[PDB]
């Protein structure tokens, strides 16, 4: 029987190959009869102006509504008739369109993906139906306290930078965005060196290549030159936005310090530290006995309904911290305990818990790369942010190296005596004053 360590070496190397465009085409062959193909693009909303904002989210809507070779609804009819699934997403920094389909179907899936990512038919009649659809989605998202808090958080931490914006854009932009606005944004961003065709499953890398030359030859070649800007850094500010509303029954709060971007090696230690603090929710079995002190004290004294630590990453910055949900009279204790753990970890982190963290992280990593879809997604994203595919063996080595000293050194650097970005919504009368939250980011013992 092979060991865990040995198994990490067994995962087939992700093969990377570049087209004469800038289009990277990468794959991880498995033995599965199913697969997942997709196009990851370096286009988000961190790339948008202000008047523009909402641009990509608007294209996502039109993306599967018709191409020039496949009109109004023909695309759907093809994807559906082969039993495939076509999905898509958009963050502040990434856009993706992926097809989840049978392995034989790889040729058509790539062909379809090309047609959508290049020959899109943003027909006036359709862009007009989508404005009504998007506005409703904005109305819907408003009822999600959690989505709101994270947008508030982004909006305050990144105050006057492009990162402060949301993906969907302001309602006024949704109703005024024109076809020209969308066409220009597509032209500026949907270009080869900023896209990666990724796949995973029962495919041979040569198929992917052939398909990529066959259906993607026709981008960046006779293109590029002037009008291709980079990304400017985004100042983190550290402040607070409170949206008092006693009508809602549970407070939502999200607090975070500025984290480093994707590239930085110290994300591993941050994740170990975050894993130790972990997450909680009112349906976890095991209450009082949970390892994480926050979790434990939260469940026993019922100081919350749920909480989760996060380490969000963007180009050269990020939001590192936690989010929680609770009754109006528990916001203070909840915070006190939350912050209690950061400092404890900043100052007195101990060896056993660090191993728990490392182990929680080894399981999260491996458990997440299970299935053509997450793996495919992983290939595409990685190449956009890392320029490589980081093999599990490397992440293992990076996790292995973390000990207590690292944890208390890396947490200190990002947490100890730094200003947080705080965002609150709901019954927040007892959300602590900023200064007090600020004063809980350091400790007088130490």
């Amino acid at each position: 029987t092979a060991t865990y360590a040995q198994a990490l070496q067994s995962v087939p190397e992700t093969q990377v190959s570049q087209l004469d465009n800038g289009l990277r085409v990468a794959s991880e062959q498995s033995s599965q009869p199913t697969c997942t193909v997709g196009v990851w693009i370096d286009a988000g909303s961190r790339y948008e102006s202000e008047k523009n904002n909402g641009a990509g989210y608007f294209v996502e809507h039109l993306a599967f509504k018709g191409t020039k070779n496949r009109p109004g609804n023909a695309l759907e009819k093809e994807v559906e008739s082969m039993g495939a699934h076509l999905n898509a997403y958009s963050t502040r920094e990434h856009t993706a369109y992926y097809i989840k389909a049978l392995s034989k179907d790889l040729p058509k899936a790539v062909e379809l993906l090309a047609d959508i990512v290049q020959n899109c038919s943003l027909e006036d009649s359709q862009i007009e139906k989508e404005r009504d659809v998007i506005l409703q989605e904005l109305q819907e998202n408003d009822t999600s306290m959690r989505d709101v808090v994270f947008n508030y958080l982004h909006a305050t931490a990144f105050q006057g930078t492009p990162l402060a914006q949301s993906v969907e854009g302001p309602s006024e932009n949704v109703r005024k965005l024109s076809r020209a606005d969308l066409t220009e944004y597509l032209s500026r961003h949907y270009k080869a060196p900023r896209m990666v065709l990724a796949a995973a499953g029962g495919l041979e890398h040569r198929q992917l290549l052939d398909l990529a030359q066959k259906h993607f030859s026709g981008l960046s070649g006779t293109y590029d030159e002037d009008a291709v800007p980079t990304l400017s850094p985004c100042r983190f500010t550290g402040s607070q936005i409170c949206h008092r509303e006693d009508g809602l029954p549970l407070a939502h709060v999200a607090i975070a310090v500025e984290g480093p971007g994707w590239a930085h090696p110290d994300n591993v230690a941050l994740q170990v530290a975050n894993a130790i603090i972990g997450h909680y929710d009112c349906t976890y079995g095991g209450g009082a006995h949970l390892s994480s002190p926050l979790a434990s004290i939260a469940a026993t004294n019922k100081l919350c309904q749920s909480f989760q630590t996060f380490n969000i990453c963007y180009a050269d910055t990020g939001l590192l911290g936690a989010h929680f949900v609770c009754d109006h009279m528990s916001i203070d204790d909840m915070m006190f305990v939350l912050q209690g753990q950061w400092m404890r970890l900043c100052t007195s982190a101990t060896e056993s818990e660090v191993l728990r963290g490392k182990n929680l992280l080894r399981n999260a990593l491996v458990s997440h790369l299970d299935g053509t879809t997450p793996v495919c997604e992983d290939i595409g994203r990685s190449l956009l942010t890392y320029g490589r595919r980081i093999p599990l063996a490397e992440w293992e080595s990076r996790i292995a190296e973390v000990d207590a000293r690292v944890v208390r050194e890396v947490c200190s650097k990002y947490f100890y005596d730094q200003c947080p970005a705080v965002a609150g919504f709901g019954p927040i009368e007892q959300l602590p004053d900023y200064n007090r939250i600020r004063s809980g980011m350091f400790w007088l013992r130490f």
Partner: protein
Amino acid sequence: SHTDIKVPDFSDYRRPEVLDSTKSSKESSEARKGFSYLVTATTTVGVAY
């Protein structure tokens, strides 16, 4: 619609070291905490006297 949620400009209040959206703030942090803390340290030395 909660997407219409602004964040009023504070340029009119921000220290100079933090006025540019174009750059980090991690740099001026040390100087900023430095200053504000030096002030309180000097004070305690004062009161101590």
